[PDB]
Amino acid sequence: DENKQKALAAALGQIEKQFGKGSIMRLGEDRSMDVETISTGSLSLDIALGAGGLPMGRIVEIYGPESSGKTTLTLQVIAAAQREGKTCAFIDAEHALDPIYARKLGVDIDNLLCSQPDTGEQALEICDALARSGAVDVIVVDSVAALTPKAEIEGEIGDSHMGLAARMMSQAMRKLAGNLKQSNTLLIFINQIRMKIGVMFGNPETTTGGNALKFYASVRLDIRRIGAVKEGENVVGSETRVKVVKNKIAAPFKQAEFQILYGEGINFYGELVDLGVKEKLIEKAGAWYSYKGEKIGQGKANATAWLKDNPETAKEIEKKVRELL
DNA sequence: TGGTGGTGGTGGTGGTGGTGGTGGTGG
Ligand SMILES: Nc1ncnc2c1ncn2[C@@H]1O[C@H](COP(=O)(O)OP(=O)(O)OP(O)(O)=S)[C@@H](O)[C@H]1O
Ligand SMILES: [Mg+2]
């Protein structure tokens, strides 16, 4: 009755007096709580994510074995970010970026902030400082397996430092979660894989840096290499596979496959033809691919060349599949 | 055969009671 209304009013008034405006409000009328996303550059993955892109303000996680293609996909993301007009930062903790290849993929070197730190504490301080400013929209840490605590860099090569990196990461998560969301900035951790001894059942694969990062993420993705793409005998690229092993903004466990060629990277148009054929928009007959009663190409490669050479029909195919899916 | 009329402050004593746990790594 009226008593409850008065009690709620007084409580909310006191709260918002003590801690400021916006502290307590109904959920439906708050626009800060909405989810928004940006593209990963691959249609298959951007549909597997469900919401069409990676979430802004959150923490994403990517890991795989050696030569799986992590930095490549992250550079594609950063590329799409600038192309829409958004600043970016790239923290290379492993000291292994090569500016040229980045230029090849599409990132504007004149605008991509960069840093090669020497200790994990310095890296995460830089992350906090950049995020808190409201000036950097995308941040990337090249490998969480290289963020060494201070005490171990100055120690001997046999000094055990049990569990220090886990403590570092657990503190860092607590600190960042709030500022990332306040500023609307996306942070991507990239991780490696180490096997575990003593497992009696199940897989032995694990990632580095403790259990903290797993709880705090909204998205986690596997990435694996599954085959080679050949031109004649000459190897030209790699075939991949991805699983959304964790999700918090859409139904999880879907997949995505695509080609990485050593040139531009993600073969957008191969993916588009595959989607068109799968959703039955592009016609096919035996080994011959067709379109609206006209024969397109007698193979994947030639058909893709056809699509690339034919901007007029490619955009129709695109928008149709996009709107359908 | 007959009584008058009030002055002026001085010096401090004594101590109580502690609260709380972080973080795995390598075939
Ligand atoms: N500058 C380059 N030029 C040509 N091919 C490259 C170049 N850099 C990477 N590649 C290829 O892309 C694949 C490796 O992708 P990466 O970006 O290194 O992802 P990664 O899984 O982190 O591998 P790491 O960092 O060496 S463990 C390999 O097929 C490389 O041959
Ligand atoms: Mg890399």
UniProtKB/Swiss-Prot annotation:
Activity regulation behaviour: The rate of DNA-strand exchange is stimulated by RadA.
Subcellular location: Cytoplasm
Origin superkingdom: Bacteria
Main location group: cytoplasm
A GO BP annotation: recombinational repair
Entry keywords, A to Z: ATP-binding, Cytoplasm, DNA damage, DNA recombination, DNA repair, DNA-binding, Nucleotide-binding, SOS response, Stress response
Induction: Induced by DNA damage, repressed by LexA. Induced in response to low temperature. Sensitive to temperature through changes in the linking number of the DNA. Induced by cold shock (42 to 15 degrees Celsius) (at protein level). 5.1-fold induced by hydroxyurea treatment (at protein level). mRNA levels are repressed in a mazE-mazF-mediated manner.
Binding-site list for ATP: 64-71
SUPFAM superfamilies: P-loop containing nucleoside triphosphate hydrolases (SSF52540), RecA protein, C-terminal domain (SSF54752)
Pfam families assigned: RecA (PF00154), RecA_C (PF21096)
SMART domains assigned: AAA (SM00382)
A GO CC term assigned to this protein in UniProt: DNA polymerase V complex
Consequence of gene loss (knockout): Triple mazE-mazF-recA mutant cells no longer undergo an apoptotic-like death upon DNA damage characterized by membrane depolarization.
NCBIfam families cross-referenced by the UniProt entry: tigrfam_recA (TIGR02012)
Quaternary organization: Polymerizes non-specifically on ssDNA to form filaments; filament formation requires ATP or ATP-gamma-S. Interacts with and activates LexA leading to autocatalytic cleavage of LexA, which derepresses the SOS regulon and activates DNA repair. Interacts with the C-terminus of RecB, facilitating loading of RecA onto ssDNA at chi sites. Interaction is decreased by ATP.
Function: Required for homologous recombination and the bypass of mutagenic DNA lesions by the SOS response. Catalyzes ATP-driven homologous pairing and strand exchange of DNA molecules necessary for DNA recombinational repair. Catalyzes the hydrolysis of ATP in the presence of single-stranded DNA, the ATP-dependent uptake of single-stranded DNA by duplex DNA, and the ATP-dependent hybridization of homologous single-stranded DNAs. Mutations in this gene were selected in directed evolution experiments for resistance to intense ionizing radiation (3000 Gy).
Family: Belongs to the RecA family.
Record-given protein name: Protein RecA
Protein species of origin: Escherichia coli (strain K12)
